[PDB]
Write a protein that binds this ligand. Structure first.
Ligand SMILES: *[C@@H](O)[C@H](NC(C)=O)[C@@H](O)[C@H]1O[C@H](O[C@H]2[C@H](O)[C@@H](O)[C@H](N)C[C@@H]2N)[C@H](N)C[C@@H]1O
Lengths: 333, 334
């Protein structure tokens, strides 16, 4: 598919969401949880549905606590002790791009209270959830990206330092990507820490793909080739050392965005190929009705939270892939 | 008046009109290749969902970017040389940043900061290649402050607000004229060569007041410092009660309309809803059947005079911002 076609798919999905948005601004999830709609502000704004995006901001604002967190409603364990701040990161970006500067300042200030100042990582478990202070690549990358959008570039550079340390410290990168470090900054290989089985088709690739996207954006912001080189290390790892599932699994969109940005910035044709392939696959999986769903077909009035999240996520990724491929073609051809 | 949905529909048709005519290099369809024809394009088109077109404008803008972070050329209109040079740079910075073109936004914003007066917080009216006396005006300062808020440079925004407060307090004859320019020391400039708004006449340039009102409201949203809300409030009251009706009718009234819509969302004051609704309806009613805006052009044209291309992108942005703040304000307060 062409960049225009990727965007057409994103717009059909955004229209589907907006048609079913609730009066208070919540998106049509079968459970009322923040993990169903945290990407909604940014995705809907990207699609030009700024009134719907602002309505999500109104809903988010009504859940905001005095410390700047949204601790509830949350049910999915990945949003409790694996990467709690994954929700907060997209909320911060979406609020900021909408110009909701009070919301973005309060959300980002809370995010920063969970940063480990010695390692640059962001803690995996939220304030109400007990934990050992471990920090993971997804919490850290999304918090770094939110830092870029809010202008906290020092925080973003520190997040990149953590990701570099995590990458250098891998004990067996050919077989496993250990996505977590302890509070001292050493890679956590324990049974209970997220680990991508890179030679199996078992998903979780965004623990590598989201760092690759963030580091590429940080390179764009700073021109520091250390970040480009880490991003390309991660992309080459996914392309050459990881299972084919890395560019096929539902979580491959992050890598697709990173590849499209890398193509615009470097012109290397393999990055265009990776991005085009991922964009086309996501486009092919879209329901004729406009949403994306693991298991459901037909004309549903709402979705389970994970499918609703995936639908907003693919609005964002197809848009970002499409615009970076379009501009890359202009710049390099 | 018209509903938020109707305001957005007008914005979308104008954005479609622009994208249909965008050139392969990303330039918008201006009869003259000048930065003042498309400086609002990245932000306006992104707000309309036309992100590939917005990124194409970013590509065009990037092709003009100089090593110091400025776009000194192509520029032809005097207002973009020695009245408010940075007016172009400010929207370019915002549009680049919201698109995530972080290298472009950092470079642009870093140049903007070189024209800041560190004693007063104002921003110089004339660019590096344009000889001048160091005067600073309300529009250069407000747009640079707004760009500072989008890029997270909040201290720079606060300093811009300080300048605006000094400019307001220092007015020598506010019932008859708003002098929008200060000297390099911050004293209000009353010479004939310095922008003045004849507030009891219907002669335009109201955005020298309206843009400060919008920026200060956004700064209040960002900080909750009531000093900024109070100054924005005072400027809106000035426009509503001491200025000619033209302040909410002239082609430049969109800035005040956006400020009113945001103030309504933040405070719930009904007068701000009324001001924003009336301005939004007026701009909607002035749109051509084709999609563009122009006070003179009436034909099915393939391009526009630079000022009408700028106005068209500007009203895409203002109708979007008015609409979303009115809709959210209704949800919160009504
Ligand atoms: C990245 O945002 C993930 N999004 C998608 C569409 O995968 C993330 O929101 C999501 O990932 C986890 O669950 C995924 C898993 O990583 C995939 O490999 C699997 N094919 C599907 C599953 N939804 C995480 N448990 C929950 C997150 O919502």
């Amino acid at each position: 598919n062409s960049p225009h076609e990727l965007k057409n798919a994103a717009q059909r999905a955004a229209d589907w969401l907006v048609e079913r948005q609730r009066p208070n601004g919540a998106l049509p999830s079968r459970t009322a949880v923040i993990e169903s709609c945290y990407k909604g502000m940014w995705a809907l704004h990207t699609a030009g549905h700024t009134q719907a995006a602002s309505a999500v901001a109104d809903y988010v604002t009504s859940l905001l606590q005095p410390d700047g967190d949204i601790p509830q409603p949350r049910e999915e364990r990945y949003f409790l002790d694996v990467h709690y701040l994954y929700a907060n990161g997209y909320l911060t970006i979406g609020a900021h791009v909408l110009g909701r500067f009070g919301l973005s300042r309060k959300l980002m200030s809370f995010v920063e209270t969970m940063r480990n100042p010695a390692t640059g990582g962001f803690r995996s478990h939220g304030p109400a959830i007990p934990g050992d202070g471990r920090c993971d690549s997804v919490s850290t990358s999304i918090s770094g990206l939110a830092a870029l959008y809010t202008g906290r570039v020092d925080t973003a550079r520190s997040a990149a330092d953590f990701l570099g340390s995590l990458w250098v410290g891998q004990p067996d990168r050919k077989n496993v990507f250990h996505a977590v470090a302890d509070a001292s900054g050493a890679v956590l290989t324990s049974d209970d820490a997220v680990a991508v089985q890179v030679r199996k088709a078992e998903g979780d690739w965004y623990f590598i793909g989201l760092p690759a996207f963030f580091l590429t954006a940080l390179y764009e912001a700073t021109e520091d080739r250390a970040y480009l080189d880490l991003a390309t290390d991660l992309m080459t790892y996914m392309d050459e050392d990881c299972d084919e599932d890395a560019f096929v699994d539902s979580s491959c969109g992050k890598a697709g965005v990173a590849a499209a940005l890398l193509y615009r910035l470097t012109g290397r044709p393999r990055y265009r190929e990776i991005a085009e392939g991922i964009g086309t696959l996501l486009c092919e999986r879209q329901s004729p009705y406009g949403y994306w769903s693991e298991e459901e077909t037909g004309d549903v009035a709402d979705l389970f939270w994970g499918d609703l999240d995936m639908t907003a996520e693919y609005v964002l990724w197809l848009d970002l892939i499409g615009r970076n491929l379009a501009s890359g073609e202009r710049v390099w051809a």
